[PDB]
Symmetry: D3
Subunit: 98 residues, 6 copies
């Protein structure tokens, strides 16, 4: 996890621990694999305005799971349809710079 | 219907919407099912219950996407978007 | 609205400022009220509150004689800026209005 | 918790349990009391479009904590300033009907 | 934009439909392009993406000769529909533009 | 400044914004501090980092609201709004 979660670990250890368990359970799908769920997470975050959140989801996916920029771009096609040009173009620019 | 009126009244707009849809869902590497699961996650992260119900229903009917698959998407909605979105979407799923 | 009827009854200072806010917002330096009301439609149509969308559209048509095709021109912008879910919800609302 | 959470209890017991722990920890503030936090929760939910979520937060607050409609109305004043007339008027109407 | 330059290079079919979408959206049945572009400003100003806001405003001023007071009339509507945070962010963007 | 320009260019608008603010924060029963904590929660549930940082800074400076109090608000943001909003706001808080 990123800087935000390290602050939580420092400030509120028990809350941190419950968040980690939540995260680990969320990403233990019954049918969908972790890669698919992380692609979904990218889509959701990219549909909103948090540029740093978008960069971090994309970076972690590529680093941790080996997700490609081509796979991310396919996620962004869905962002365009669901969410419009502003979200799409912002996300595409972030992907390009990664 | 709804798009049925767009087709009749605004044929150019309708034609470009059909093409936008078709092109979006012609992925370079991810398949259509994966893209539709992403679409469900995005819509479920918001408050439009109709979009959510419609998105889920179409996915199940058109693609054979399962309720368990949808629930796996909703897990991600909880983490990204919080309890209200998650519990609303789970209630919707249960009625399908 | 029902919301505003009770605000007027129960919270007269808040109601007073709300009316004045509305009046001042819609007293543009350059843009006319029709243009501003079309902008308002676009903004609420870009979001998920069906009631707000139906109310902005219905008041526009009633107050200003705005047509469904004019509202649809607004919804074109909603599609581009906001995506298919917002567009399709708002277009169904418009059609049924 | 409401119908959504009962579905989660039925479908995913371990996920349900982690959510309950998260909830209980979130509402164990270090300084702010539970009433204050629930008023904040009303504000946040009311700032968005989920009418059912708004009705449920308000109902539970009034039932569980004895929060008044006058206190909720003061929350909604802040919703107006932060979020605009649509959110304010929708929330006020829901409060009125409660 | 940078986003669109790479889409054009890498994804020509998607780029093609995006351009056509834009062109069709901004070919209104009744409303003119200026009105539609003001609506677009209002919608993106109601949300949190500063880049989109700066881009819509800058293109409006450049393409259409839209003035800061005209944009401010849009922002009046943003305040009413969307609240102080959106209004103040967008007004600062406008002022600095 | 930003509102400083509004004051000069659009005096009626400015005057009504000041009154809206003042009236909103004249609660019938809740105090100003409680209302400002609510405001922090609402803004933090969204993506505008500047609004969040400004809201927190003003609250601490104007009202003596503490970082621990702000963190208690952010707990509610996590539950209502998810991890991204929570972790972003915690990162902002840490720098204040």
């Amino acid at each position: 996890f990123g800087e935000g979660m390290k602050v939580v670990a420092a400030a509120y250890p028990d809350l941190y621990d419950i968040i980690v368990k939540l995260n680990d359970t969320v990403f233990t799908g019954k049918t969908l694999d972790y890669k698919t769920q992380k692609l979904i997470a990218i889509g959701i975050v990219a549909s909103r305005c948090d540029e740093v959140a978008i960069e971090k989801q994309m970076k972690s996916a590529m680093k941790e799971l080996g997700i490609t920029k081509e796979e991310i771009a396919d996620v962004l096609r869905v962002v365009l349809l669901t969410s419009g040009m502003p979200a799409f173009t912002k996300a595409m620019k972030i992907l390009e710079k990664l």
